[model samples]
Target: MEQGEDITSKKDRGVLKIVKRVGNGEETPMIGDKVYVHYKGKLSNGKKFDSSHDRNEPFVFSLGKGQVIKAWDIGVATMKKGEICHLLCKPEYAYGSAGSLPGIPSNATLFFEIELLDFKGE
Candidate 1:
């Protein structure tokens, strides 16, 4: 028997692709790519939930090598230094159906202002 928490959400659900470019598209964040970013997440109702940028410190994550939400891996992979972007990620890309520990809602969509501050390595 599957537990209610075990089977709550679907993979690839609620993903919103904002733009695509030539060559390799999808702007997927990959392993070893260093990045500095700013962002804020809001519910569908536009409420502030979480933001590292708001705390006055830029976020640093190493592409595929970093431990962060799946969306961060995919989203940061395609970014270039000094580039700014906004992302609208669905539940699958955010916290999924179970949602975070507190404040976030189930089946909720998330928003982000991710910026590629720098990068290095292969």
Candidate 2:
């Protein structure tokens, strides 16, 4: 990614908003790729809900497998390995009207600082 690069909205005018990006990795993960990520998840009020770093391990999941939030599948597809980005996800793409996990609120928008630690395509 380039310095001073602006956040770009997807062509579809989707709910996810990518605030920053920095990466030089050549490989971009595909749908079946297994991704290892470190992430900090927060609410619109800026309250933290989760942090993979707090567990001392990156979260691992198969991309496009619906193992995580919809925003993650959409946003992570746009990233490269080792990429770091801040994504603002509207409720529709996040937990939606029914919020998941213990700390998040229903119909709440969310924020995330996600680092694409690594990935391998299936």
Candidate 3:
């Protein structure tokens, strides 16, 4: 999916890499936008943890609302419409030292294959 796969930083400690793209869409979403996406979550070893694709539904959230992880806010905000991306989310940007409920482990570096389906910018 990715061409370069070179990691780049947006916010501090946040890395975002674009994997694929469609049409060049302007206006990336900001803090107040509502976003809809499909994502596959994995561990550092490429082990799958969760997937919105598997559910046949997109994950929807209001950007920067803490409705999702902070790295997602930083990373996805950098995406243009119809982009597919890979986000390597570090512990501080994710669930932190306590980890998550079922799949995520403590201090884990989570990986994600994310598609920006659409978003309503505020």
Score each candidate by Cα lDDT: 0.63, 0.78, 0.80
Across residues 27-50, which tens digit of lDDT does each residue of candidate 3 receive? Answer: 688888999999999998888989
Task: State the lDDT of candidate 2 residue by residue for 1-122, as single tens digits.
Answer: 43222233544433444535567656678999999999999887788999999999999999999999888888788788778888777777788878885688888878889999888868
* lDDT head-to-head 1 vs 3, winner: 3
Tens digits of lDDT, candidate 1, 44-120? 78888888766988777677764777766766665655556666777777788899858888778787665565566
TM-scores for all predictions: 0.70, 0.84, 0.84
Clashing pairs in 1: 28-77, 29-74, 29-77, 30-64, 31-64
Rate residue 33 of model 3 by lDDT: 97
Candidate 1 residue spans exceeding 4 A from truth: 1-14, 17-30
C-alpha lDDT of residue 64 in model 1: 73
Deviating ranges (above 4 Å) for candidate 3 = 1-13
Candidate 2: stretches off by over 4 Å: 1-14, 19-21
The predicted structure with the larger TM-score, 2 or 3, is 3
Work out candidate 2's RMSD over C-alphas: 3.5
Q: What are the clash counts of all predictions, listed in order?
A: 5, 0, 0
